[PDB]
C-alpha cells in the first residue's frame, strides 16, 4: 500500500484511524498515529492487507504511536487533501495564530487555525497533556490523522475534538471548536524516527 | 473532548 498521511487503517479489524506521517527508523518502515489507536502488537491493515503492527504507544498521558511497516510499504513524503497531495517539507512547529489543516478518512481536508497550546483533554481514559488545539473541524475516525500548514510542515496528529452527537464538531461555528492534536517533535525524538519529506 |  502507498503510505500518504490522512488514509484509512484498521486495527486488528476492528477500530478505524487515520495515518499521520511516513517516518523511517534506520532500515524500518514505518508511519506515526494517535496512541489511542491500538496497543502494541495490534494488526495494521489498510484496504483489507496486513501492512504492520503497532511497534509502541503512549496513551493517555500523552497520545502518541508508530507503527511498523512491512518492506513491502511504499512510504511518501505526502498528506492526501481529497484527489490531491501536500507535500512533507519538515517538522517546524507553527505559532499559535497560523492557519493550519488536517487531513483524516472521516471528514477529508479541514483547515483553520491554532488557537492555544499545552492543552489538557481529559478522556474517559485519563488525562492527555500538552496538546495544540486548532479549530479545524473533525469527526470520529479522524485520529492519528495529519496536522500540516499548506507549506509542508508537519506539525503533529489528531488526538479528540469536542464532537456533537452528528460525531464532528464541523456543524458548530470555528469559534467553538476544540480539535486537539500531539505535536509531531516529541513522538519523533521519542522514538529515534525520521520524517519522510520531499 | 472525546479521542477520534
Redesign the interface.
Known amino acids: 500500500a502507498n503510505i500518504v498521511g490522512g488514509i484509512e487503517y484498521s486495527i486488528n479489524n476492528a477500530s478505524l484511524?487515520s495515518v499521520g506521517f511516513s517516518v523511517t527508523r534506520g532500515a524500518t518502515k514505518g508511519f506515526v498515529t494517535?496512541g489511542?489507536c491500538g496497543t502494541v502488537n495490534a494488526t495494521a491493515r489498510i484496504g483489507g492487507a496486513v501492512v504492520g503492527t503497532f511497534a509502541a504507544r503512549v496513551f493517555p498521558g500523552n497520545?502518541r504511536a508508530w507503527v511498523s511497516l512491512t518492506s513491502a510499504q511504499t512510504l511518501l513524503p505526502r498528506v492526501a487533501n481529497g484527489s490531491s497531495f501536500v507535500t512533507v517539507r519538515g517538522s517546524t512547529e507553527a505559532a499559535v495564530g497560523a492557519a493550519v489543516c488536517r487531513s483524516g478518512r472521516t471528514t477529508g481536508y479541514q483547515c483553520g487555525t491554532i488557537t492555544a497550546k499545552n492543552v489538557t483533554?481529559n478522556?474517559?481514559?485519563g488525562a492527555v497533556r500538552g496538546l495544540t488545539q486548532g479549530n479545524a473541524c473533525?469527526?470520529?475516525?479522524?485520529?492519528g490523522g495529519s496536522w500540516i500548514t499548506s507549506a509542508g510542515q508537519a506539525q503533529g496528529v489528531?488526538?479528540?475534538?469536542?464532537?456533537q452527537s452528528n460525531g464532528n464538531n464541523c456543524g458548530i461555528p470555528a469559534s467553538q471548536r476544540?480539535?486537539?492534536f500531539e505535536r509531531l517533535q516529541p513522538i519523533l525524538s521519542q522514538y529515534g524516527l525520521s520524517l519522510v519529506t520531499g | 473532548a472525546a479521542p477520534l
Open positions: 484511524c494517535a489511542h497520545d483533554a478522556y474517559a481514559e473533525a469527526g470520529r475516525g479522524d485520529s489528531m488526538s479528540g475534538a469536542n464532537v476544540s480539535s486537539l
